[PDB]
Subunit: 162 residues, 6 copies
């Protein structure tokens, strides 16, 4: 019994940089999406993609611990993540930049209310990482870890706009 | 600075099952390639792909610690890996099945003769895993680890046949 | 004049197996679609794809003689069929499994009410086969033949749910 | 057990027209390939593709019952067939124009020296039709049928030039 | 700074012919789109694509200076253009036929209301040419030139039907 | 009699920057190819791609007026150009950066020994631009324009190495 997942798109990832620290971001629609705490109170953030840094404006901060950043007009990503129409939360693919490295792993996952729990392969920083279904559609945004157990908040289309 | 690698193909992976345990294999040409110790003394091995188990026969065991298995005629993989023409060994993407999970990570790497060394994300079983360049072409086959340092044997087209 | 049709996807086909016999099914959305009489009054059916058998649960049986089956979670089809936006019923592509063989043919067609009619090269059972337009989008689900004339029930996005 | 074949390219087919009759041709490289008897002693043939007729010139008639026609400069086919690297002759996909209609079917096959034999769905002529492996690569050129048994001549890359 | 634009699709272009002259058309959905004045009062126009001429019937003439022609059933284009969801008008890619030849150029554009202004690379007939965003989605339909300054009418999904 | 060309890849273009001025470059294999005079006597040139400038080293200067630059290890282009196997010099596609803009055009071409002549759409510098066949494979490297007449030197696989 193995997790044979599909449409894994590491090119949909970027690195978010702020004075306070760094996180993982991901392209979806016209947005860059990340964890709220990566952005904090900042109105603008630095975005790193394929070795070039951009300045980007924070668009929307809902009540959920997610942040929406307007993708810079000159940043043309090779891949973007779509949301799931028929979400199966039973297994996931997690993609992240951890320090200098890409880290991708599959895991089985469990739901608690608005939250998802799953195993991760590093204890280092994964904040903002997209948690995708077996078909590569984003289900959730990685928030935190306790040891090798990860936790994410579920995202849905209604989160994008007030 | 981050390792933003390309043409990462987890669909080119399979699991090799023997009475001694399990390893990772990968599709290349008409073969399934793995580490010699994954095959052991089993002329016939089990191959698991997309949830279906196949019996497959070892084709060739060169001097290098690598094994070539004939891909079953009814096994139609969605992806295969090609070897590099102009190999850059400075950085790598390693893709493996670790227990039930896909684990993919990038790393800086170093060459010591026929051996490639690189940081790994698990101490667990990565035997047979393809070690690819930044463009997703196979450079080497993962053999062993000492802690979080992995070691692989470099592969070239002349290794495929006697 | 020849029917030069496009986007023909045999990977979107599977075989449905019941105690009463076999038929063709096709992947569309998160469903496997077939003719109602292939399923009958069975609540569960067997689905065969790329050499693996799965048990699958019948989801929905509308007034039309079409059956919707929930695609098993572990079955990841390489292709799915989409419905036509602006249907041209003047000609078709029919794809089916007949015993061990894939069979694809084009034909002139005529629509009348909810039935689509077209010549079939063979009198073999094609129950549940997708009947596609010239661009590979599904127009109808093949029902029966009399004897060299096929009959299919036209399919609509509203047919998927009550 | 079913023949679940891949990379089936009906857009790689055309129709060859002569005073003596019509046949199937297929694009490979810069050529259109057909059976030697579809061309006969003609130096120029008519080629029909996507509704447009072209005049084309016969390039090469080797000893094998196969004919090579230079593809007209203004005919830009949407698909071409490649030859097999590691040819499996045990099963096939046959693609043909039969009158106005595309006909595609799979079958088990067997080699007899230079000849490949296989079941055909129709007793209608399919002269010049490509006989492909399970991966859509061309193995042979259909020559004749006797009842429901088709016969083809195996093709080499060496057959393309003297 | 350079305009590095994407998804440029010349196969989505055709040439429209009337007794009064010629213009550029483009495929979108089931239609061919062009400038209203290319069509004029004609109910049928001639369409040229990949070397074959077709007769095509004008479908709908909205208040905007845009013409919608029903794509001939036997005309199967290799590419079609989609409209943008969140249109960025700041830079464009213009694709047209000028006499026998394809001409593609980028420009910065100004929005204004229902009209779009940009630099063009020729003073010749570009009437009906698609004006695309940096991602190859149609924003507008080219109308006229005053020197090397082009003007276009913005296209909207609601323009397709009354 | 329009030119309907294919596989146009503007993503395979870059800009070469030197103290003496600028040119167009194109990705092929592991190289960036341009006109010899773009590079001149420089050992290192600057390369601009998707908004990021890199330093690159000149690999090889053959007797032909063509220059080979090693692609920077951190520059990962989205497209590369291949050479043609059966070169048709009758017509071409020329792709270039002209100041800030991308310019793409087709034209009939004229052969004089190892050189090619064709119409171009600008009088501004295009030095180093790829001259492609109707299928988007590179035939020649653009050298200079005199007025709206472009001149290029034909390239073959042996030019890449001494
Ligand atoms: Cl498995
Ligand atoms: Cl899975
Ligand atoms: Cl950063
Ligand atoms: Cl699951
Ligand atoms: Cl970075
Ligand atoms: Cl990198
Ligand atoms: Cl297993
Ligand atoms: Cl590196
Ligand atoms: Cl025809
Ligand atoms: Cl047709
Ligand atoms: Cl398919
Ligand atoms: Cl079955
Ligand atoms: Cl029709
Ligand atoms: Cl089966
Ligand atoms: Cl098979
Ligand atoms: Cl095709
Ligand atoms: Cl014909
Ligand atoms: Cl077989
Ligand atoms: Cl630039
Ligand atoms: Cl841009
Ligand atoms: Cl195109
Ligand atoms: Cl014309
Ligand atoms: Cl812009
Ligand atoms: Cl034309
Ligand atoms: Cl042409
Ligand atoms: Cl491109
Ligand atoms: Cl620059
Ligand atoms: Cl030409």
């Amino acid at each position: 019994k193995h997790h044979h997942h599909h449409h894994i798109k590491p090119g949909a990832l970027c690195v978010i940089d702020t004075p306070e620290g760094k996180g993982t971001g991901f392209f979806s629609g016209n947005d860059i999406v990340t964890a709220a705490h990566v952005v904090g109170n900042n109105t603008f953030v630095n975005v790193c993609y394929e070795g070039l840094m951009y300045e980007a404006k924070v668009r929307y901060m809902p009540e959920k611990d997610i942040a929406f950043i307007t993708c810079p007009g000159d940043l043309h990503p090779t891949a973007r993540l779509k949301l799931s129409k028929n979400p199966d939360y039973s297994c996931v693919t997690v993609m992240a930049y951890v320090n200098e490295d890409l880290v991708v792993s599959t895991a089985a996952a469990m739901v608690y209310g608005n939250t998802l729990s799953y195993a991760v392969r590093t204890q280092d920083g994964m904040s903002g990482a997209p948690v995708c279904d077996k078909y590569c559609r984003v289900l959730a945004v990685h928030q935190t870890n306790t040891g090798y157990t990860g936790g994410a908040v579920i995202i849905d289309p209604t989160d994008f706009h007030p």
